[PDB]
Design a protein around this ligand. Structure first.
Ligand SMILES: C=C(/N=C/c1c(COP(=O)(O)O)cnc(C)c1O)C(=O)O
Ligand SMILES: C=C(/N=C/c1c(COP(=O)(O)O)cnc(C)c1O)C(=O)O
Ligand SMILES: C=C(/N=C/c1c(COP(=O)(O)O)cnc(C)c1O)C(=O)O
Ligand SMILES: C=C(/N=C/c1c(COP(=O)(O)O)cnc(C)c1O)C(=O)O
Ligand SMILES: [K+]
Ligand SMILES: [K+]
Ligand SMILES: [K+]
Ligand SMILES: [K+]
Lengths: 455, 455, 455, 455
């Protein structure tokens, strides 16, 4: 149903809300970009589930046993062994977080002019692919771009689209397939095991490599257990292990499903690629024996990845998100459906029908939720999508959304109720939300520090 | 109206989540005595609110700054400053917990044959009074002994009974008035400020001392703010300070309202008694500047007492307990009323009205509660009452209860739902609850290690 | 020789020294009692090895896994199992520190008017024995009272003295033998295994009980390994286990050799005594399942007791003390010999030859070492010895000493050099140290808070 | 004169203390490559001073107060304030460590074909300069290349070489001057304030930028205080602030002089470059307000940088390294001179003068050192120099050294004695040290995983 937390609270941090008049000053001081607000001025911080998780007593015990040696740290061996056991890959290179591993993969596996195809883009991933000379091709099925369509396993790759790509371009012009689990910008939507099998079968027959974005793979495994016929009595760990058996390697931001505040890694099976990866990690991250992490953080990530396999933990994690979505849907608030593993996405096009996407309604809605509730949320729409690196025009995604992102093990259902009640009230006078225009635009990943003004 | 938690989760404590059939085996291995269960086998542990609290990030930062010097630790001076500021007593002596301070007070303040009068009693407090020669007298208002009477400030002293004692025994033969806030034995019932001032006025005219058992004084202060006319504009801190302005000293268990896992202290205004207390603390506890605590623990207690003064924290603490009581009462489950600041007491005599008291209904209900939910609660009935070792017969208390004692900042409303739903389900077939019989009974402390089997 | 530290530094705390002019103000503000100086005004704090130790990374990991449950804590089970394994006693009752366990033993095992005989007195131990009606008899051999006499195993009981006691008083009038390892006030002097065997053999033939003061038993085991013929190839743990095989129980301050900042316990083999001990611990300390300690402190004590068994750790501990003694002796500074396990004792009678013991030269020397070096040390002489509870006169010990007490794993050899150099310079003008007289004297354990003035 | 540690030990790190014959087996299993040893097998780990430091109790308190928000963390604002105050730069961007900041600076400040000139180089710094199109020029004073020349401020830039570069290539073709403090590759040699001001004066007249590699800037500042006339009355903080007043920005590895285990940052004064840096940091590291660090780590680095300004701390840090160098030099052991701020370099070419460089004398000496003492040191000779993959021949460095790199606040003078005594003993029969040959050699990063056997 909605289960209670399968843990107790060991330690707390205080929350507080500043008056509406002062939030109004803060939002315009931040140029109406929620990324630019200060943590102390936020009451419930749903900007991201990345690095914001609460660790366990066992992880904090591991934090006291950091072996900070430059080479041969016990913490590295623990992390390496844990990932080999749970994911099944032959080799691991730690990185300080996920985009560090993406930096390595894109430099190792892309020849300029080749294609990289994935189930919907992501911001840092697509930037590193294009920066190294690849053309991104979206091979997610069309349904994943329709926010309201409630169907299972929306993250699945369209095998017909993948096949057409191989036929029009040729397999040797495809650097690799990028399969993300879950799919973040479709709403945290899962990929089925059947789809991972079929993608593996078709790519292998053409010699094309498959690399997973593993960042929310445990959430994805929960959906397989819950909804894919035949997996109902498999453990989360068995599902995770089988998932990665259809891949040649992975990038991972441990800051998501490894239940830590920093950390990531790169996995692969190929020996020559591992050799090249170790040469490159030294330049950007650190020695292959710590990869830009303190020993104590490799330890916490090794412990957290194993905690994430507990069924009751991930069931509660996902159903707590679902609770927030269910309360918003029962009141008529338009959301992306089905609710995904890590966040509820408000459909900003339906919330702000009076605005065109060129007026940045998602960015505008996020500012308004902060001013009316003190809750921080993130823009996931035209601002995040960036510009086309050939024409200079906005990428125009069908999904213009505002993300209420739930950190793991941090908030309660009563906090979800506070969030839901505040958004339901804002819905009543949604016509009051104004369009926005750029006054400062970065040349890449512009959503991080852009500044706006009301039209 | 039930407020959301005025904090978020910084770190979590692991639990195992064993299912019902396994919980049944654990309960049988414990001989159906919840006191014998292993902590690692318990999902929600409501045995006591003493020392089971979750600390904040600020307290844990203080735990890293323990000055472990034997004398003159900076942590002692921080604790001393905090207690002098918030409680307003001239002098303070730390103790390892509350019954350490009681040991000291009773040796300092009692001449043999004298009387100590209180608003009911607690077992350790009254033991140290009687061990040092005092005769205990209950001067609580008669209503406190009616567990179904729903009235405010049930812990108040009957001023008439106090006056009768003074007239019948003489002021010079009364060692002190022991005023407890809240009154644990009545179910955690508060005392009004008007009552505290009347007691201070009457005693001061006869030269009689008043010492507070201050263990849940912050919960008491919230009741004054919520329900006593004239205190709606006062802060929790202002109410706490005025409360102790009507006392000559106090004993304090930090393990309750100071939000720590260990610690207590003794306060007084009289220089002479302070001098004598310092001569005695080294006998049982330690130096006047650590009193049987590590430096880091004096530090955590100094920080936690100040955190307890936040209105939102204590409002939520008391209303979370109230939520559990309200939910049970709405389903018809019999409880002590009103609900107190720290616990809900089930009336097992009425819950298990098909069982006689010699079949230990509270002990059996507590066993059933664990089996059905994974919740541990405390027997507070005939078993805890002990046996008259002269005659061999049970002590038979009027109150036959199960205490659901709520640690501070550890559980959520969803955990409260687990507790309530399980008990409500048990109540709907309460006639299936079986009686218990002794299979092992020790000579003393029988509630701690006795084992039972079903009749 | 003098080995290097068999550990690395994991974390530090800053030290500083305030000018001589300000130390002079501090010492007279403290009434010339070093117990009354503030930790922040001390540069190197050698007041005591009690509770001042540095814990390890493994202990701090255990501190993050405190199971704070009132009954059935995993931390209690770990401590109980560790003590049963390493000491070999059947039963354990935790206490918040050593004098808590002494309080329990003295109340359990003493009938008023009986004799308790031990190898030299200690302050808290003797107070609890006399408070419960016993007469203390010293059965240490005479040599232990001669500071300069360098002989091995000065802590040994004189079997002839023990035999005479049995003959003059009768075995039934002796409550028990108190055997301390090491013997603190003789200078931290060890007891031989042969002596523990012989004491066991003679007491057992008369039905007299033997209880050990186990507080520095690991230091004592090191001396046995180093110097007792036949033990050179036994492990520290084997020696510890055999030592306690000659005892009926023990009191322990974990604050010494268990490498913690708080904690102790009481061990015994007799079932009825354990039953009585559990009834009494509830009054003074807490439930038998935590005994006045947080769960995390039972955990740290269980881990620390096992760390203490590492040969290289205890060898370095003892040889670091010896280094300080050797440097002082090489310069001609009079000390107690042989150097003991935990401290160097300056012979205040030889340091202050110009003073009589009634002028409290040890107390005076401690004040002077602070004023000239900022190092804190403790009086261990006529002030600590207290008054005779029949005549009212000073107990007059032959050992009038000032103790430089070394906390475990806190200071380096360079710190020892700083201490030695400062004391050697004070030695040059030792005639400048003045006699002291009481201006405030507590009625018991007077050394803790007494205030003095120069004669 | 060598000062005592200006701190005491708060907590210790466990080590195993394995004996010589077992250390020999560990060294053989590591193929005689110290880089392949397990940390758990090492007593004293002198492989690097990077990230191996011991933190204070205050830093660990800050570790409990990590604000893990994705944007606007309070810990970032604390770090920003601290760096602006102590270094005096207008703007700061955090990075996960030093080579992250170097990546950013080189992309921001270099147009392809331009020159970057420095006082020697470090491998990661120069890689990012060359990767972005720069041609490196060494402008250090010629004396820095004489490893036996005992003169002050060996890291100084030759102003004549700088002027020649400007005249020969033109100011518009020089991207920046890279001034390192200290100069790692010369053995940790400092730069004078007079040199920094002369470089700033000369560059400023041509519009050329100067950026500092600030990694060991506090050790540098101590040398200025100790040895540059006119700075004897200046605080470490005053010297640090003046140093950076001669730069346009810096790259900083907190893993060195900020006394942390992870962390770095980039500073600059130019608003435009700051804006561009913020657009780039999100590509590789993270948000401008966390830059690939956990909140708790920005907090530890803010606290640690301020602790590094204490004169007594940095005096003892540098003089502990000097102690090791002095002891070796007194016994005739050949070292690079003068001893630098962070390490002693053994001259393995002269130590093992019976071995040719093709027999890897530094690699073999480092193996022998571990076997005899349990000390790990780093090869800095022909193995680390790598192989010319075009021709197949070794890169043959003039310096064939073993680096004994000293982490901050981890070891004592007694540990330094273990290191020195072992090396001095080896030197007394240096002709017994055997040559090594490759048995496994990887194509790149060969010093990390190569394995050897004896000739
Ligand atoms: C920061 C976020 N995402 C990070 C992310 C990344 C990049 O990871 P780091 O933030 O750890 O670099 C990669 N792949 C996916 C699917 C991700 O969601 C976020 O969604 O808030
Ligand atoms: C342990 C409990 N009571 C402690 C207590 C105490 C004794 O405090 P310590 O447990 O800290 O000794 C004193 N006074 C009152 C009113 C108390 O409730 C309990 O109710 O479980
Ligand atoms: C405090 C000290 N001694 C404590 C002690 C005690 C009392 O322990 P607590 O301080 O843990 O109560 C008992 N027995 C011996 C031999 C002791 O040395 C000291 O010597 O500084
Ligand atoms: C890791 C080392 N050096 C780091 C370093 C770096 C790179 O810093 P990170 O290791 O923090 O990337 C930059 N500049 C200098 C002068 C350095 O010494 C070392 O010497 O072992
Ligand atoms: K590190
Ligand atoms: K302590
Ligand atoms: K506790
Ligand atoms: K974070």
């Amino acid at each position: 149903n909605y289960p209670a937390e399968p843990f107790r609270i060991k330690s707390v941090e205080t929350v507080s809300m500043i008056p509406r008049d002062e939030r109004l000053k803060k939002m315009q001081e931040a140029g109406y970009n929620t990324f630019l607000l200060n943590s102390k001025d936020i009451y419930i911080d749903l900007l991201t589930d990345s690095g914001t998780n609460a660790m366990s007593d066992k992880q904090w015990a591991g934090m006291m046993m950091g072996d900070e040696a430059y080479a041969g740290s016990e913490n590295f061996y623990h992390l390496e062994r844990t990932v080999q056991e749970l994911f099944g890959f032959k080799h691991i290179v730690p990185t300080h977080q996920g985009r560090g591993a993406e930096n390595l993969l894109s430099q190792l596996a892309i020849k300029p002019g080749q294609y990289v195809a994935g189930n919907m883009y992501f911001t840092t991933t697509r930037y590193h692919q294009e920066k190294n000379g690849a053309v991104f091709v979206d091979i997610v099925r069309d349904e994943a771009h329709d926010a309201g369509l409630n169907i299972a396993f929306k993250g699945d790759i369209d095998l017909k689209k993948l096949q057409k790509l191989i036929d029009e371009k040729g397999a040797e012009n495809i650097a690799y397939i990028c399969l993300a689990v879950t799919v973040n910008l479709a709403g945290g939507q899962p990929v089925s095991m059947a789809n991972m099998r079929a993608v593996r079968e078709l790519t292998e027959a053409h010699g094309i490599k498959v690399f997973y974005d593993a960042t929310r793979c445990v959430e994805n495994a929960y959906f397989i257990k819950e909804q894919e016929q035949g997996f109902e009595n498999k453990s989360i760990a068995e599902i995770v292990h089988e998932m990665f058996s259809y891949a040649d390697g992975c990038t991972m931001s441990g800051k998501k499903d490894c239940l830590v505040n920093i950390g990531g890694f790169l996995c692969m099976n190929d020996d020559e690629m591992f050799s090249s990866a170790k040469e490159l990690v030294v330049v950007y991250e650190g020695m292959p024996s710590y990869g830009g992490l303190a020993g104590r953080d490799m330890e916490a990530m090794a412990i957290g990845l194993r905690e994430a396999m507990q069924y009751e933990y991930i069931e509660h994690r996902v159903k707590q998100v679902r609770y927030l979505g269910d309360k918003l849907k029962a009141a008529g608030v338009p959301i992306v459906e089905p609710v995904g593993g890590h966040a509820v996405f408000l459909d900003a096009r339906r919330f702000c029908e009076h605005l065109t996407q060129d007026e940045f309604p998602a960015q505008s809605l996020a500012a308004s939720i902060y001013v009316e509730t003190g809750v921080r949320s993130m823009e996931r729409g035209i601002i995040s999508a960036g510009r086309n690196n050939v024409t200079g025009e906005h990428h125009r995604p069908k999904l213009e959304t505002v993300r209420l992102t739930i950190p793991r093990r941090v908030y309660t259902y009563a906090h979800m109720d506070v969030v839901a009640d505040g958004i339901i009230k804002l819905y009543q006078h949604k016509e009051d939300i104004r369009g926005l225009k750029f006054i400062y635009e970065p040349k890449q990943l512009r959503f991080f520090t852009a500044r706006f003004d009301y039209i």
